[PDB]
From a paper:
AcrIIA15 is an anti-CRISPR (Acr) protein that inhibits Staphylococcus aureus Cas9 (SaCas9). AcrIIA15, by combining the HTH domain and Cas9 inhibitory domain within a single protein, exhibits dual functionality as a bi-functional anti-CRISPR protein capable of both transcriptional repression and CRISPR-based cleavage inhibition. Our structural and biochemical studies demonstrate that AcrIIA15 functions as a dimer to simultaneously inhibit both anti-CRISPR operon transcription and SaCas9-sgRNA DNA recognition.
To investigate how AcrIIA15 recognizes promoter DNA in a sequence-specific manner, we determined the crystal structures of the full-length AcrIIA15 or the NTD domain in complex with IR1 DNA at resolutions of 3.15 Å and 3.10 Å, respectively. Specifically, amino acids K31 and S25 form hydrogen bonds with the bases of the G6-C6′ pair. Importantly, these AcrIIA15 mutants fold properly, as confirmed by CD spectroscopy. These findings show that AcrIIA15NTD sequence-specifically recognizes the IR sequences through the establishment of base contacts between helix α3 and DNA. Specifically, amino acids S14, S15, N16, S30, and N34 establish interactions with the phosphate backbone of one DNA strand adjacent to the 5′-end.
Numbering used by the authors:
A (entry chain B): 0 to 60
B (entry chain D): 0 to 61
DNA sequence: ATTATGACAAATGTCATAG
DNA sequence: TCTATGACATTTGTCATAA
């Protein structure tokens, strides 16, 4: 779960809900992350891996 | 913080307390992950990045 | 479709102590 | 030394809403 790649997804123009549906992570968590209420560091490795996989599968394209 | 590399440090012969001093993480969590009372998935990215950085440094020795 | 805030059960980090 | 167990304040993930 590279912090930089997850950071790219969160800073992407992709919708918070749209990222959430594909990642499987809650839109709530994505919104609170982008806005600032939650920290990426406190995220469960399981959730972090999902975000990293979604962003990497896009970078190769 | 690749799950596989952290899984490798957990499976290592290094003492739970030895890894804790070097990583800054608590012996409690490492011991509980090894015991299996704690899931690696439920760990924070902050703490896992620390255990990951340790393993990568050990990997350089090969 | 999208955006925000919660509630809640169940964890976690960071400290101990106990064996 | 080492592991094991827990306390506690805080934060999660899940599952909602309301706009």
């Amino acid at each position: 779960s590279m912090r930089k790649t997850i950071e790219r997804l969160l800073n992407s123009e992709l919708s918070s809900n749209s990222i959430a549906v594909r990642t499987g992570v809650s839109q709530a968590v994505i919104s609170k992350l982008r806005n600032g209420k939650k920290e990426l560091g406190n995220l469960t490795l399981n959730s972090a891996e999902k975000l990293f996989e979604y962003q990497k599968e896009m970078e190769k394209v």
